[PDB]
Paper text:
To identify possible spatial arrangements for assembly, we analyzed the crystal lattice of CI2 by X-ray crystallography. On the lattice, the protein forms double hexameric rings in which the two rings are packed head to head and rotated by ~30°. In solution, we find that CI2 is monomeric at concentrations up to the millimolar range and remains monomeric even after unfolding partially at high temperatures.
As scaffold for implementing fold-switched allosteric assemblies, we chose chymotrypsin inhibitor 2 (CI2) from barley seeds. The small (<70 residues) globular single-domain CI2 is a paradigm of two-state folding in which a sturdy native structure unfolds at an extremely slow rate via an all-or-none transition. The CI2 native structure contains a four-stranded β-sheet and one α-helix connecting strands 1 and 2. The C-terminal β-strand is inserted in antiparallel fashion into the sheet’s middle, breaking an otherwise parallel arrangement to form a unique fold that is specific to this family of serine protease inhibitors.
Residue numbers in the entry:
A (entry chain A), B (entry chain A), C (entry chain A), D (entry chain A), E (entry chain A), F (entry chain A), ...: 2 to 66
The structure:
């Protein structure tokens, strides 16, 4: 059971999300982007993109990639 | 009768919208985005996106998702 | 004859536009957006979107919807 | 109670959708478009856009506009 | 009173639209495009774009331009 | 445990996907779209969009919505 | 000979452009937008859109519309 | 006076447009594209793009570039 | 050394690409899409998207995801 | 002097373009796409994309990449 | 040999780029835009668009147009 | 073995990325852009685009081009 998504983080702050993700995935390379940002298709097993809203809350389920 | 949309909130401030939505749906995870922002198709029964205008008023009918 | 568009407001300030629209349509729910913003297809008989330019002047004919 | 949306038509054929909509709204001007097509913001009280999928089934809730 | 828009043509066939527009504006240069097509901002007093749906019916109000 | 996604269907034909989804969710309203198609944010608990590739194989994880 | 475009204004400031356009077209309704902004197809004989760059210089030929 | 645009060709067929352009600009490299197609910013003094509609009529003013 | 990309397949046919990929990754779920198609960010360790050109040749480096 | 662009091929057929490019760059991996197609930023020293128009003529300067 | 592109300016500041371009093309009308900005197809022999990055460095080869 | 990509820089600051890239490629012309920015297809063997997130960390694998 590999932890690959954090549905429990939707609506939480980016600071709380970073803390949780690094506890579950200490190698995570955390990227913080506005919702709607276009990204590439290249997969990175250690990257976790956090898509944030106007108040810097997690707006979409974080996933590895 | 499940409360899934708030047409009565269009034109209201984000503060008033948050207060109303949390009264009707105490588990709501409220996300605040500019109008026009592209989002994912993943459904979250407890998320309510608020799409706001230049004056932080609700610009589209809030819906669960 | 239902007032549904304000061609006379193009180039006017948002403050003047709001004043005129509310005189003609006292129930108007006025939304202020940058020109070019993508919106939904849902119709709201009482909403009037004002699309503004860099100087907060009305850039497109306001219409109900 | 004005009939303005047909959630019951999602997944149905365009022929069945047209028949139902014209029964409920005999003045309907029915437009048939692929899902994802960009449209204008102009409101037409008698227009009903049907957004269809690859098999010509209704893919989104038809609404007046 | 210059005829610049044909709201009465929404939902009609392109053949019927062409016939009506040329009666009202004999100099019209009629262009037939799919709904959603991006066009330029250049204005042509004699051009009338007809935006058509999957069944070649007029999907948006024809306007001069 | 509500069945809301079918990761096991990626790469399978649309016919096989429809058969599996209707077994798991007999009320499913199945919509078949090309990959990349833009859709609305409205949630439909009984809709399952199938996004297909050039060979009509499932290209993305089907999800309810 | 109707003045409908100002190629001579490309690269000039918005202040200088406004002054020239109003001399040539005293009824002009001047709209100031960033380059690349999407606009509507509706034609307004008295509107002149000025598309400006990062330094508020005219980046495209102003035209009536 | 360099011939750089053919407003007189809007609404004409691509065959008639090609004939006229090659008479005025015998070195023209004529490219035929659907309206709305995105192109590059590279300038080619001898290229003339013809943007055509559903009936292969010229939909926008041809220009050199 | 996990095989995750096939730069050697650019320009090859989709049939040859499928044969090579399945030799290197027998569990591959092969998806065939036109170049430029927008996809989701969800990662699937067993999916390989093949982006093809007008002649069904591989146009971009296939990668797992 | 490395041959990296073929401005002389604009307006020529794809067959003639392929013949010329392979004479100048025998290792070329030739990709044929419609004008306007979005591609990735990954550089391939041996790939040459040919962007073609409705008549399969070269519409943009071919370049290596 | 007409100077129409400045590959040597990529990565340089906008101030240095302006100085070089005006030395080579004293009539240049210099426009400064963010990378990615959509522009029109109209050609202006004296315009040079500078597309800049987050640090106001030249991000793409300046070209006349 | 030509150094053309820096997967090890994902998640690192732009300052650290610049230092590493210039050590490996002293001729690098470093461009700093927001994630999602559209760029041209022109290849520059000495350019390295750094796509950064809201916190100015490298969000995508830097590559030459």
């Amino acid at each position: 059971d590999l932890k690959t998504e954090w549905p429990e983080l939707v609506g939480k702050s980016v600071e709380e999300a970073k803390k949780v993700i690094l506890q579950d995935k200490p190698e995570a390379q955390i990227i913080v982007l506005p919702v709607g940002t276009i990204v590439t298709m290249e997969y990175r097993i250690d990257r976790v993109r956090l898509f944030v809203d106007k108040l810097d809350n997690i707006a979409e389920v974080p996933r590895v990639g």
